[PDB]
Amino acid sequence: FNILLATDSYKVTHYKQYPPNTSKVYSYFECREKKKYEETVFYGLQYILNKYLKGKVVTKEKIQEAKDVYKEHFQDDVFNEKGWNYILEKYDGHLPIEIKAVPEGFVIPRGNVLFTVENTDPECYWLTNWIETILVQSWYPITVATNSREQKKILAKYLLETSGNLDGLEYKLHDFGYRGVSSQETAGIGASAHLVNFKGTDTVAGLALIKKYYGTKDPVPGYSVPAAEHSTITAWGKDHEKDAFEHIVTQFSSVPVSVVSDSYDIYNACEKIWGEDLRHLIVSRSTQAPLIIRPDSGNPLDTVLKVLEILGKKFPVTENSKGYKLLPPYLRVIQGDGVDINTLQEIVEGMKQKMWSIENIAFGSGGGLLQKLTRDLLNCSFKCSYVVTNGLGINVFKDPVADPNKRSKKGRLSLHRTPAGNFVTLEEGKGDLEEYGQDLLHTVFKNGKVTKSYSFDEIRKNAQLNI
C-alpha cells in the first residue's frame, strides 16, 4: 500500500489551487440531514487509522513510484515531490495531522460533526484534503452499522409485542453477504459493522478484523450453526431429497441445523417429507438443537406465511402469553432470500396479522445487509470549514443556490450535550465560550500516532437500543 496513490487524481493538483500563504486547512465529516435514518452509529475510523495512516507511511521508494505513475497519468509533472520529501525528512514519514472524533459505537442524530481533520505543520496545509478519499470510506462501516441497528429496532418491537421478551434478538438477523460484496476487504469491514448490533454471521472475514483492530473479552464476536446449500441436497439426485434431509439432520443431531427445503418444491418438503416421512427425527430433537427449515424462493412474505400454516397443521402448535402461535421448540424457520430493511418490516407485520410469534423465525440477509448501500443513504460528506491565510483565520463553506441540503458548516466545529441531553454542533469556534460545557470529540490521531482506541465490547455497549 502507498498512501501517495490512495487519493482522487485531481487532489494531486490541489496544492497549486489554494490561496498562497495558507498555513491551515481544517475539514470535517458529517451525515448531512435531509428535507428515514435520523441517527447514525459511528464505527470504522479506527480500522483506517491503524491499517493506512499510522507510523512511517512515506518512503523514498513510494515518492518515486508515485512521481513515475503521475507523470504518465497526467502526461505532465504536477506531483508535489518537495511537499512529500518534507514529510519524509522532518517527521520520518509520519503524517503531521490531528484527527478528533466522537467515540465509536456512539449514536448521533444527522447533521452533527463526527470527526475533524487538520494539519499540525504550516508546510502541510495540502495534506488535510489529500486524505479525504481514504477517510470518507468511513461511510461504509457507518452505513452498514446504522442500517443493521434500524433492522434490530424493527425485530425488537415485534418480538416484544408477540412474545413479551427479547430472548434471541441478537441472533435473529444473520449475515449471509460474503459472496454478495465487492471484495474480501469489504466483506471483513461489512461483517464487523453488522456484529456491532448482532452475534450471528457466516462472513468469517469479520472475525479476524475485530480481533486485530478492536478486540473482545470473548474469544470470537460472532457465531454460526451447521447448514445445507442446494449442492448438498441436489447432489443426492432429484428422487432422493428425503435421503439427503435424513443424512444431514442425523449427522448434526445434537446441534441446531438449517436445511434449505425449496430445491424442487418447498410446500411438499414441509408437508410430506418433514411433516410425515421424517417427522419422527424432528420431534425427538432437543430445545438446544432444533431443525430450522429454510425457504429460498418465491414472494418472501407469502412463502413464510404458507410454510408456517403447513407446519402448524403437522406439528403441535402452542399459544404464548400474548395470544400468538408458537411451533414446538425443536422446529424453527429462517427466510434467507430477498431480505432488506423493507421486506423485513413487511414479513414481521404480516406474521403479526396472522397471529404467528416472531419467536418462530430468524432472517438471513446478504446483499441487503452488506452491498445494497451507498454514500448517498446518510449523505456521508467531508468539507473544509476553516483555513488560515496570511495569518488570518476565515470561516469557509459551500451554499449551492439549487440545493440548500448541500450547505456546509462554518469555521472550527465542536460537539456538545444540550441541557435536555441531546447533541448540538457549534460553528464559528463558539465552543470556546464554554456555554455548552466540554467538546465531546477526542483526539484519536496526531503526528502519525493513534492516541485513543475502543474495544469492540465498548462499541457494542455504546450502540445498545433504548428499550
Q: CA 128, 133, 135, 136 torsion: positive or negative?
A: positive
CA distance 446 to 98: 4
Site for ligand 7YT in 188-217 (CB under 6 A): 200, 202
Site for ligand 7YT in 401-420 (CB under 6 A): none
CA distance 177 to 363: 12
Residue 256 binds what, of a second copy, ligand 7YT, none (CB under 5 to 8 Å, by partner type)?
A: ligand 7YT
Q: CA 410, 412, 414, 420 torsion: positive or negative?
A: negative
Binding mask 61-100 for a second copy (x = CB under 8 A): --------x--xxxxx-x----------------------
CB of 37 to ligand 7YT, least distance (A): 24
Q: Could you give phi then psi for residue 385, rounded to 5 degrees?
A: -120, -15
379 contacts a second copy (rule: CB under 8 A): no
The helix or strand, by DSSP H or E, that contains position 449, with its residue range, turns out to be strand 449-450
Bridge partners for 99 per DSSP: 117, 445
Residue 53 vs 173, nearer CB to ligand 7YT: 173
Residue 52 binds what, of a second copy, ligand 7YT, none (CB under 5 to 8 Å, by partner type)?
A: a second copy
407 is in an annotated binding site: no
Contacts of 78 (CB under 8 A, 6+ apart): 12, 13, 16, 70
Which of helix, strand or coil describes residue 116?
A: strand
Q: Stretches 52-60, 170-178, 210-218, 240-248: which one binds ligand 7YT (CB under 6 A)?
A: 170-178
Residue 420 binds what, of a second copy, ligand 7YT, none (CB under 5 to 8 Å, by partner type)?
A: none
264 contacts a second copy (rule: CB under 8 A): yes
Q: CA 171, 222, 454, 142 torsion: positive or negative?
A: negative
391 is in an annotated binding site: no
Q: CA 142, 144, 145, 150 torsion: positive or negative?
A: positive
CB of 383 to a second copy, least distance (A): 7
Residue 341 binds what, of ligand 7YT, a second copy, none (CB under 5 to 8 Å, by partner type)?
A: none
Q: Quick one: DSSP state of residue 337?
A: S
Site for a second copy in 168-197 (CB under 8 A): 176, 178-186, 189-190
Residue 408 binds what, of a second copy, ligand 7YT, none (CB under 5 to 8 Å, by partner type)?
A: a second copy
369 contacts ligand 7YT (rule: CB under 6 A): no
Q: Per the structure block, which three cell numbers stand in for 18?
A: 489554494
The helix or strand, by DSSP H or E, that contains position 260, with its residue range, turns out to be strand 257-260
CA distance 113 to 425: 6
Residue 51 vs 352, nearer CB to a second copy: 51
Which of helix, strand or coil describes residue 164?
A: coil
Query: Which residue in 402, 463, 422 sits closest to 195, CA to CA?
Result: 463
Query: Which residue in 51, 56, 27, 45 sits closest to 135, CA to CA?
Result: 45
204 contacts a second copy (rule: CB under 8 A): yes
CB of 252 to a second copy, least distance (A): 7
Site for ligand 7YT in 444-463 (CB under 6 A): none
Contacts of 399 (CB under 8 A, 6+ apart): 407, 408
279 is in an annotated binding site: no
CA distance 77 to 67: 8
Exposure class string for 96-122: b at 16+ Cβ within 10 A, else e: bbbbbbbebbbbbebebbbbbbbbebe
129 contacts a second copy (rule: CB under 8 A): yes
Residue 336 binds what, of a second copy, ligand 7YT, none (CB under 5 to 8 Å, by partner type)?
A: ligand 7YT
235 contacts a second copy (rule: CB under 8 A): yes
State which of residues 23, 120, 389, 451 lies at the interface with a second copy (CB under 8 A). Answer: 389
The count of chain residues that interact with ligand 7YT, using the rule CB under 6 A, is: 20
Site for a second copy in 44-63 (CB under 8 A): 52
State which of residues 205, 362, 380, 440 lies at the interface with ligand 7YT (CB under 6 A). Answer: 362
Residue 142 binds what, of a second copy, ligand 7YT, none (CB under 5 to 8 Å, by partner type)?
A: none
Which of helix, strand or coil describes residue 414?
A: strand
- Distances in Å between the Cα of 185 and the Cα atoms of 191, 296, 369 are 10, 27, 16
CA distance 9 to 69: 11
Site for ligand 7YT in 12-71 (CB under 6 A): none
State which of residues 228, 291, 308, 426 lies at the interface with a second copy (CB under 8 A). Answer: 228
104 contacts ligand 7YT (rule: CB under 6 A): no
Residue 112 vs 186, nearer CB to ligand 7YT: 186
Q: Report the binding-site residues for beta-nicotinamide D-ribonucleotide.
A: 202, 294-296, 336-337, 367, 375
Which stretches of the chain bind ligand 7YT, using CB under 6 A? 8, 10, 168, 171, 174, 176, 200, 202, 224-225, 227, 256, 258, 292, 294, 332, 334, 336, 362, 364
Annotated binding site: 179, 202, 230, 294-296, 336-337, 367, 375
- Annotated binding-site positions for diphosphate: 179, 230, 294
